[PDB]
Design a protein around this ligand. Structure first.
Ligand SMILES: [K+]
Ligand SMILES: [K+]
Lengths: 383, 383
C-alpha cells in the first residue's frame, strides 16, 4: 500500500526493529509467499472440505453413481498437483445424510441431506445442531427470548475475549427465569467457578465442548440485550467488549438465524421454525418487534426507529403521512452528546451530517424528506 | 390461681375494664363453662375424628365385621347424649385404607392402613403425605439436606407470623442449589411477589394449599440452619421469629420426622427411609452428624457438644478418658456474654449455675464430673 499510482514518485516502506529482532526483519524483506495448499489434503482419511464437497454434488443431483464421484476427484485442485473419496461417501451414509440403492450403487439425498444443502450449513456442524434442536424441543422455555436466541447463537469462532470474573458476577445477578435456561442447556455453576478461580482453558480434550457451551450462553446474553435495545455503551461496560466485536457478532447471528430457520423448515419442524423466523430481522438491526415495520425504510436504523416510535410514528403508514420538518426534529433529538444536550447557528443549514452506503452527504433535512418519500413509495408497494 | 392453699387467707381477682367494656367484664364473672361437645358430630356425614377412630379398630384387629362397627358407635360419647359410621367405612375403602371381602362383609387392613396406624398419622393427612412422598421419589435433590427436611417439615399449624417481605429478600439471596428445591416443590416466585406487594392471605379456596407450600418451604429453611448449628440469635434476626417459636417447632419436627420414617418403613420404601432416619436426632438437638454421638450424654446439648468437639473430644469414648477439670474449662468457654469475654472470684466455687430436668443445682465442676461419669457408663454399655 506504499505508492499512489499517478501521485507519488516512489513508495517507501520502513520496518522498525531492534538488534535482537534484526534477523527476523530481513527474513520478511527477502521472504516470498508459500505455495498454495489444497485444503482437501488427507491420519485423516476423511476431511470436512471433502465431505461438504461430496454432499453438494449428490444432493444437488449432478453426481449419482460411484463413477461420477471419482470423475469429480479429477477436477479438484488436489488432483492437479499430480481412496479418500470413498471414505466420505460412507460417512454420509453412516450419518443419514445420503441413501444407497443397490443400477448398482446409486446415491440419493435424504431429507437431512437436502436440508443441509438448503441451509448452507457444514455437514460436520449439522450433526451437533440437529441434536441440539431435538434436545430443545423436548423441553423449551418460552417465557423469555433467551432460549430461542441460544439456538441461533453462533459459536464456530471467538468474537471476543471473555472476562470470566465479569461473567460470574452477571451469573449471580441473573434472574431465575434465565438461570433455568442456563441449566437446561449445560451451563454448570461449578465450571464457571473453575474459570474465574483458575485461568485453565483446557480445551485439549474433544469432549471439552463444555467450554463452547459457556461461551455460547455468554454470547446469547449479549444478543438478548442487543435485541432489547440496550445501548452499545452499556453492553460494552457490562460484558467487556467493544462495539466492533458486537456488530461483527450480530451480522453473523442474523445470517446464522436464517440458516437454522431454513433447516427447520425443510425437516418439517413447523413449531420450531415459527419461533425462529422472527429473530433474523431483530438480530440484524438490534430492535424489538415493534420497530420491525419502521426499519424497512433504508435510512431508519435501531436508534432512529425508536425515537420515531416514541413520538407517534409506529408504522410506515404513519410515517408516510408525516410532516417532513417534524421527522427532521425527532431525528435531531436522537443525537448523542457528551454533555446533557438532548446559540443559534444558521450556517449549519448545509452541513452534510448523515452518512449512507454509496453515499452523498445528506443534511438532516434532506434525510428526513428521503425517509418520508421512501415511506410513501413503500406504502404503495404494500397494496 | 388466686389463693395459695395453706398460706393465704383469701385469693383476690381483679379484672381491669373501661366503661365501654364494663358489660363484657361482668359477663365473665357471672359466666359458666359451656357443655362438652363430642367432636365427632355430623352437611358433613364424614368427619376426621370418626375416620381415624374407625381405622384404628379395624387395623388393630378388634373390629372386623359391620356388627362390630355399630357396637363401637354405642360406646362413643356422641351416642351417650341419646348412618355416619357406614360412610367412614366406605371412605376407608375408596382410598385404599381398608379391604372388603364378601363371611359376608368383613373388613381388613391394607399395607397403607397398617402403615398409617404405626405412624400415628391422621388418615386425612396421610393421603397428601403419601402423594408428596411418591412425588419426591420421582425427582429428588441430594446435594443438600433441604429437600429431605421439607418432607419432615410439619405444616398443620402456624408456629410463627411470617414476614413475607423478609422472605422475598432471602429468596433472591438464596443459592441456586436451594432454588432448584423450591421450584421442584411448588414454590413459585410469582406467588411470593403477590404476598409482599399485597397482604392478600386468601386461603378461602381449598385449592389454596399453595399458601401452605410457601409456609412449609420457609419453615424448612429455618430447620436447615437449625441443624447447621446456626445461632438462635442469627435465626431470629434472619427470619423474624423468637426462640420460643423455634424450640416448639424443632420438637414438633423431630417427632414428625420419626413418623414419616416409620411410614416409609412399613411401605417398604427403604431408600427413602434410609435418608430420613438420621434427621429425627438432628432436629431434636439442632446439631450436625458429628455431634450425634456426644449428645447421647444427658447434660450435653448442641452448644456443649460443639465446644467439646472443637477441643479434641469427638466421641463418648474420647470423653470417658477425659480429665474432669479439662471438661469443666471447655464448658466455661461456651458461656454467652454481652461483652467480648469468651478479677478472680473464689466465692463462686459453690454457685449452682447449671440447670437440669428434675434438677438439683449443679456447679460447673459437678456437671463436668457427671458428664465424664455418664460417658464411662455409656462406654461400657456399648460393649
Ligand atoms: K434500514
Ligand atoms: K442430651
Amino acid at each position: 500500500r506504499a505508492g499512489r499510482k499517478g501521485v507519488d514518485t516512489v513508495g517507501e516502506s520502513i520496518l522498525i526493529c531492534k538488534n535482537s529482532e534484526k534477523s527476523k526483519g530481513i527474513a520478511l524483506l527477502q521472504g516470498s509467499l508459500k505455495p498454495v495448499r489444497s485444503c482437501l489434503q488427507r491420519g485423516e482419511e476423511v476431511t470436512g472440505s471433502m465431505i461438504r464437497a461430496i454432499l453438494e454434488i449428490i444432493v444437488g443431483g449432478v453426481a449419482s453413481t460411484s463413477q461420477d464421484m471419482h470423475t469429480y476427484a479429477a477436477c479438484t485442485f488436489l488432483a492437479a498437483s499430480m481412496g479418500a473419496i470413498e471414505a466420505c461417501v460412507m460417512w454420509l451414509l453412516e450419518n443419514e445424510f445420503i441413501q444407497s440403492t443397490e443400477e448398482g450403487k446409486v446415491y440419493h439425498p435424504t431429507h437431512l441431506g437436502s436440508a443441509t444443502l438448503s441451509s448452507s450449513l457444514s455437514p460436520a456442524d449439522t450433526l451437533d445442531i440437529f441434536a441440539d434442536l431435538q434436545r430443545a424441543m423436548k423441553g423449551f422455555v418460552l417465557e423469555n427470548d433467551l432460549h430461542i436466541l441460544y439456538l441461533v447463537t453462533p459459536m464456530f469462532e471467538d468474537w471476543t475475549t471473555i472476562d470470566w470474573y465479569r461473567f460470574f458476577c452477571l451469573w449471580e445477578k441473573l434472574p431465575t427465569s434465565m438461570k433455568r435456561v442456563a441449566e437446561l442447556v449445560g451451563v454448570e455453576e461449578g465450571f464457571l467457578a473453575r474459570c474465574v478461580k483458575g485461568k485453565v482453558v483446557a480445551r485439549t480434550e474433544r469432549q471439552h465442548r463444555q467450554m463452547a457451551i459457556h461461551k455460547r450462553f455468554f454470547t446469547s446474553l449479549v444478543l438478548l440485550d442487543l435485541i432489547s435495545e440496550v445501548p452499545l455503551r452499556e453492553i460494552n461496560q457490562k460484558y467487556g467488549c467493544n462495539r466492533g466485536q458486537i456488530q461483527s457478532l450480530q451480522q453473523s447471528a442474523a445470517v446464522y438465524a436464517g440458516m437454522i430457520t431454513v433447516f427447520s423448515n425443510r425437516l418439517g419442524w413447523h413449531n420450531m421454525e415459527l419461533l425462529l423466523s422472527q429473530f433474523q430481522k431483530r438480530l440484524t438491526f438490534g430492535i424489538q418487534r415493534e420497530l420491525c415495520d419502521l426499519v424497512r425504510v433504508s435510512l431508519l436504523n435501531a436508534q432512529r426507529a425508536r425515537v420515531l416510535y416514541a413520538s407517534g410514528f409506529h408504522t410506515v403508514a404513519d410515517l408516510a403521512r408525516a410532516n417532513i420538518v417534524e421527522v427532521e426534529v425527532i431525528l435531531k433529538n436522537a443525537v448523542p452528546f457528551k454533555s446533557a444536550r438532548k446559540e443559534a447557528v444558521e450556517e449549519r443549514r448545509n452541513m452534510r451530517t448523515i452518512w449512507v452506503t454509496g453515499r452523498k452527504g445528506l443534511t438532516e433535512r434532506e434525510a428526513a424528506a428521503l425517509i418520508v418519500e421512501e415511506a410513501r413509495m413503500i406504502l404503495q408497494q404494500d397494496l
